[PDB]
Amino acid sequence: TVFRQENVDDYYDTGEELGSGQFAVVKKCREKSTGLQYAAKFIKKRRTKSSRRGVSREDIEREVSILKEIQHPNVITLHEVYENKTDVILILELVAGGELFDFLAEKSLTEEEATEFLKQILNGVYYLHSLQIAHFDLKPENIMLLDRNVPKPRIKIIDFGLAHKIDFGNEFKNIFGTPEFVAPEIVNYEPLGLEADMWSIGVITYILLSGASPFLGDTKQETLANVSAVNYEFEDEYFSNTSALAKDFIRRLLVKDPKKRMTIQDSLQHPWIKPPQFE
Numbered sequence: 001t002v003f004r005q006e007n008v009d010d011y012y013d014t015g016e017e018l019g020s021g022q023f024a025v026v027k028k029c030r031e032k033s034t035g036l037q038y039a040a041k042f043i044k045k046r047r048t049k050s051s052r053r054g055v056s057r058e059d060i061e062r063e064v065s066i067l068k069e070i071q072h073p074n075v076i077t078l079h080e081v082y083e084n085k086t087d088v089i090l091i092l093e094l095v096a097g098g099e100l101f102d103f104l105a106e107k108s109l110t111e112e113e114a115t116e117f118l119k120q121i122l123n124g125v126y127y128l129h130s131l132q133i134a135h136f137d138l139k140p141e142n143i144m145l146l147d148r149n150v151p152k153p154r155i156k157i158i159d160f161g162l163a164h165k166i167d168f169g170n171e172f173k174n175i176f177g178t179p180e181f182v183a184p185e186i187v188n189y190e191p192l193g194l195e196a197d198m199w200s201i202g203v204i205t206y207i208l209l210s211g212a213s214p215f216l217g218d219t220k221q222e223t224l225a226n227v228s229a230v231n232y233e234f235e236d237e238y239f240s241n242t243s244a245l246a247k248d249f250i251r252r253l254l255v256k257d258p259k260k261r262m263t264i265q266d267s268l269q270h271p272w273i274k275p276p277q278f279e
């Protein structure tokens with residue numbers, strides 16, 4: 001599909017840089033016609049076939065197709081798309097309160113502060129999985145807060161660069177994210193489905209409760225090995241006054257066999273809740 005090929009600067013003014021990827025840079029911007037603010041994500045296109053730099057058109061089209069389907073309080077929405085010879089430019093909903101990642105670097109969290117965040121993440125993922133969309137890159141840097149300076153911040157899931165529609169219950173190959181957060185089936189290059197997201201949620205939950213990463217090794221390869229082996233434990237020093245139900249929630253997500261892992265629907269009914277790979 002093609003996108004609007006007018007100069008984006010004719011319609012938007014750009015401001016501060018909000019964030020950076022290997023092939024993307026995200027800048028605050030303001031639409032001239034409405035004065036509304038957005039985040040413009042500039043994704044570098046492939047310059048050839050078989051070039052390693054930039055993102056393939058097929059991959060950019062998939063990210064755009066998925067973003068266009070989304071409208072939910074806990075996910076990002078897509079406003080407009082532009083393109084030119086070098087970039088595709090996604091005008092995304094602005095999330096102005098920073099990464100959950102940097103929020104956690106400031107603040108440990110109480111179990112209630114952890115569940116406040118987690119319930120919203122689970123609601124956003126329930127929405128996506130209801131659509132058969134696997135996000136495949138869930139981690140604290142890809143959660144954003146609308147406002148950091150409130151006692152119970154609202155979050156939106158961002159970064160659909162690895163997301164895929166799963167229309168057969170699994171897809172074959174193999175959308176490798178960040179070693180600390182990827183499920184064993186990603187590590188082992190096995191068919192992947194919605195369950196891989198649920199593993200990432202267990203990793204995120206462990207970190208929210210402890211400030212520590214459950215599988216992190218000294219090298220990317222050692223982390224990957226730890227993940228495949230399900231090499232983690234609840235350190236007394238971090239978890240001694242965490243509730244057993246919170247540990248139970250994590251244990252049921254950090255399960256090697258995706259068939260045996262909690263589903264997003266299971267996770268919402270759980271008693272605790274129910275009311276870049278190579279060095």
Ligand SMILES: Nc1ncnc2c1ncn2[C@@H]1O[C@H](COP(=O)(O)OP(=O)(O)O)[C@@H](O)[C@H]1O
Pocket residue numbers: 018019020021022023024025026039041076092093094095096099141142144158159160161
């Ligand atoms: N809608 C948004 N609002 C505010 N900041 C954003 C938004 N989207 C992305 N960012 C920031 O930009 C960074 C990179 O964007 P991302 O979508 O993760 O691109 P990629 O992971 O493909 O490089 C994020 O980690 C975040 O800090």
Ligand SMILES: [Mg+2]
Pocket residue numbers: 021141142159
């Ligand atoms: Mg990111």
